[PDB]
Design a protein around this ligand. Structure first.
Ligand SMILES: CC(=O)CC(=O)SCCNC(=O)CCNC(=O)[C@H](O)C(C)(C)COP(=O)(O)OP(=O)(O)OC[C@H]1O[C@@H](n2cnc3c(N)ncnc32)[C@H](O)[C@@H]1OP(=O)(O)O
Ligand SMILES: CC(=O)CC(=O)SCCNC(=O)CCNC(=O)[C@H](O)C(C)(C)COP(=O)(O)OP(=O)(O)OC[C@H]1O[C@@H](n2cnc3c(N)ncnc32)[C@H](O)[C@@H]1OP(=O)(O)O
Ligand SMILES: NC(=O)c1ccc[n+]([C@@H]2O[C@H](COP(=O)([O-])OP(=O)(O)OC[C@H]3O[C@@H](n4cnc5c(N)ncnc54)[C@H](O)[C@@H]3O)[C@@H](O)[C@H]2O)c1
Ligand SMILES: NC(=O)c1ccc[n+]([C@@H]2O[C@H](COP(=O)([O-])OP(=O)(O)OC[C@H]3O[C@@H](n4cnc5c(N)ncnc54)[C@H](O)[C@@H]3O)[C@@H](O)[C@H]2O)c1
Lengths: 291, 291
C-alpha cells in the first residue's frame, strides 16, 4: 500500500489547477503538466490569486506568514509540458484534461508505458466510465476514478470510484490521499455520472429547457433556485462556472450511449454558445457576460 | 387596488402555519383555519415554538423584546374550523391544504359564495394549474397562485402566478403583499411546477431512482449533494422535510398528465412509504427515522 507524496497532475485548467493547489497546500510535491508554457504560466498565476485571497484573509494579522504560505505552496508546484518524462517516477497521476473518452484513453495508454510500476492512475472524469479508461492500460489494479468538485479549494467532496479490477490497496491509498487533502471521500460505483453529476447535470439541462421553452428568464430561474431552494448558485450561473463546453461534452456522451433517452437531449442554446467559443467564466462569456 | 390587511389561511400544516406566522409577524390580521380544534391547537403550538427560536436569534440581547414579539404575533392569529364563516370580511384567502385538485376546487367553489366581493383568492399549490382551480369559482379576475417555500419563516422566494383571467389589480395586490411579508416575489407562468418545482421535484425523484437502483445509499447520496453541490440538504433529507405524501401527489399528477415522460415515473419506494403512512418529518418517519 503506497502513501501518495509526489503527485503528477495532467491538465492545468479549472480542476487541474485547483487539485494541484490543494495537494501542494497540504504538503505533497506536485508537478502540474499542460500543453504549452503559456497555459502553465496562466494556471500557476491563477493558483497564486486563489492563494493570495486566502492569505489576505487568513493571515490579516500575520502578513509575513501569509506570504510565506503562498510562496511555499507555489514553490511546491513544479510545471512541465512533457508528462511522459515526469511520470517516470511519481506516486500518482491525476488526469484532468478535456472530457473526451478517446483523448483520455490515448493519454493513459501512453503514460502507462512510462510510469513506474507502483504508480497509481486516476481520472477526474465527470461522466465517462472508469472501467473503460482503465482497460486502455495494463495497470487496471492501479486504476480508479478520483473525482473532485469545482472549485477544488472549497468543495469538500471527492468521489472515489473503483472498477471491479481496482485493488483494495489502490483504493485505500486514494482514500488516504483524499483525506490528506482535507477532503471527504465517498466510494462510488462506476456508473455514469457517479452520484453528483448523474443528478446535477440533468437538472441543469432541465433548467436550460425551461428557458428555451420560453417559460422564464435565466435571471428569474437563478433567483428562484437560490431563494426558493437555498442553492449557492442558480443553474445558469453554475453552468457558466463549470464550463459550457464540459457540460455539452458530458451530455453528448450520454446522448450517444442512449439516444432515445430524452433526458440527454442536447440543447441548441448550449450548442450555439459552445460553437461561438463562449464557455462561461473560462472564456469570459457564457449564458452571461463577465468582465 | 386593495391593500391586504386581513388574511385567512386555510390549512395549518407545514406551510399554512408558516404563512400565518409570517403574516401575523408582519402586522396582518390573521385567521388560521383547519379541520378540528385539536389540529389548530397543535398548529398554534408549533407556530409559538417557531416564534421562540426566531426570538432567540432576532432578540438574543433583549429578552423582553423577544417575549413581546412572540406574544404580539400569536395574539394576531385567530382560529376557526370553518373558513366560510370568516371570508365574508377577509381581504385575502391563502389556501394551503392537501395537494389534490378536486378537494381544492370544492373548497374554493364554496368560499366563492361567502367571500366579500373584493376578496382575493390565492392557492399555494405546488403542481396544479391555477387556471383549473380558478374556474371552480366565478372570481377568476381575483384568483391567482401565491406559492411559498418550505420553511416559510426562512425561504425568501414567493412565486406569484397569474392566469390569463387574473386582473392587474389583483396581481399588484399580491406582489405588494409578498413584499409586506418581507419576501421576494417572482412572477411565473401558470405551467406545471412553475419554476422551482418543475426543476426540483424531478431531481428529487432521480435521487430516489438512483437509490432504488442500488447504485448508492441515501446517506452517501445526501452527503455527496451537500458536500459536492453545496446544497443545504441532501435529496432524501429534503424529501422527508417536504413531505412524502405531498411529493407523491405532485408526481402522480404530472404522471397522469404525461404517462410516458421518464421525469414523472412513480417510485415504488416512495409509494410504499406513503402507503405505510411514513410521510417524513411531519409523521416522525419517512426515508429516515426522526424523534
Ligand atoms: C461539472 C461536473 O460534472 C462536476 C462538478 O464539479 S459539479 C459543480 C460543483 N460545484 C458547485 O455546485 C458550485 C456551487 N456553488 C458554490 O458552492 C459556491 O457558490 C462557491 C463554492 C463557488 C463559493 O461561492 P460563494 O459562497 O459565493 O463564495 P465567494 O463569495 O465566491 O467567496 C467567498 C468565500 O468562498 C471562498 N472561495 C470561493 N472560490 C474560491 C477559490 N477558487 N479558492 C479559495 N477560496 C475560494 C473564499 O475562501 C471565501 O471564504 P470566506 O467565506 O471565509 O470569506
Ligand atoms: C414543494 C414546493 O412546491 C415548494 C418548496 O417548498 S420546495 C423545498 C424548498 N425548501 C428547501 O429546499 C429547503 C432547503 N433547505 C434549507 O434551505 C435549510 O436547510 C433550512 C432553511 C431548512 C434551514 O436549515 P439550517 O440552516 O440548517 O437551520 P437549522 O439548523 O435547521 O436552524 C438554525 C437557523 O435556521 C433557521 N430556521 C430553521 N427552521 C426554521 C423555522 N421553521 N422557523 C424559523 N427559523 C428556522 C433559524 O432562524 C436559524 O438561524 P441561525 O442560523 O442564525 O441560527
Ligand atoms: N469544470 C468542472 O467543474 C469539473 C468538475 C470535476 C471534474 N471535471 C472534469 O475534469 C476534466 C477537466 O475539466 P476542466 O474544467 O479543468 O477543463 P479545462 O478546459 O478548464 O482544463 C483542461 C486543461 O486540459 C489541458 N489539456 C488537454 N489535453 C491535454 C493533454 N493531452 N495533456 C495535458 N493537458 C491537456 C488543456 O490545455 C486545459 O488547460 C474533464 O474531464 C471534466 O469532466 C470538471
Ligand atoms: N410541503 C412543502 O414543502 C410545500 C411547499 C409549498 C407549497 N406546498 C403546497 O401547499 C399545500 C400544503 O401542503 P403542506 O405541506 O402544508 O401539507 P400538510 O399535510 O403539512 O398540511 C395540510 C393541512 O391541510 C389541512 N386540510 C386538508 N384538507 C382540508 C380541507 N378540505 N379544508 C381545510 N383544511 C384541510 C390538513 O388538516 C392539514 O393540517 C399543498 O398544496 C402543497 O403542494 C407544500
Amino acid at each position: 500500500k503506497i502513501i501518495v507524496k509526489h503527485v503528477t497532475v495532467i491538465g492545468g485548467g479549472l480542476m487541474g489547477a485547483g487539485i494541484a493547489q490543494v495537494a501542494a497546500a497540504t504538503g505533497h510535491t506536485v508537478v502540474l503538466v499542460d500543453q504549452t508554457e503559456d497555459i502553465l504560466a496562466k494556471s500557476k498565476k491563477g493558483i497564486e490569486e486563489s492563494l493570495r485571497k486566502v492569505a489576505k484573509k487568513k493571515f490579516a494579522e500575520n502578513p509575513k506568514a501569509g506570504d510565506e504560505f503562498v510562496e511555499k505552496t507555489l514553490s511546491t508546484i513544479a510545471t512541465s509540458t512533457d508528462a511522459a518524462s515526469v511520470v517516470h517516477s511519481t506516486d500518482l497521476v491525476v488526469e484532468a484534461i478535456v472530457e473526451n473518452l478517446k483523448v483520455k484513453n490515448e493519454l493513459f495508454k501512453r503514460l502507462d508505458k512510462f510510469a513506474a510500476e507502483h504508480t497509481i492512475f486516476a481520472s477526474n472524469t465527470c461522466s465517462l466510465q472508469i472501467t473503460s479508461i482503465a482497460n486502455a492500460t495494463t495497470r487496471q489494479d492501479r486504476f480508479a476514478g478520483l473525482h473532485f468538485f469545482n472549485p477544488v479549494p472549497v468543495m469538500k467532496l471527492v468521489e472515489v470510484i473503483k472498477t471491479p479490477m481496482t485493488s483494495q490497496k489502490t483504493f485505500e491509498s486514494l482514500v488516504d490521499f483524499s483525506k490528506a487533502l482535507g477532503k471527504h471521500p465517498v466510494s462510488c460505483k462506476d456508473t455514469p455520472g457517479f452520484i453528483v453529476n448523474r443528478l446535477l447535470v440533468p437538472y441543469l439541462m432541465e433548467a436550460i429547457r425551461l428557458y428555451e421553452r420560453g417559460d422564464a428568464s435565466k435571471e428569474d430561474i437563478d433567483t428562484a433556485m437560490k431563494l426558493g431552494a437555498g442553492y449557492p448558485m442558480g443553474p445558469f450561473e453554475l453552468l457558466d462556472y463549470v464550463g459550457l463546453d464540459t457540460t455539452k461534452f458530458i451530455v453528448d456522451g450520454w446522448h450517444e450511449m442512449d439516444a432515445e433517452n430524452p433526458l440527454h437531449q442536447p440543447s441548441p442554446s448550449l450548442n450555439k454558445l459552445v460553437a461561438e467559443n463562449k464557455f462561461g467564466k473560462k472564456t469570459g462569456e457564457g449564458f452571461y457576460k463577465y468582465k
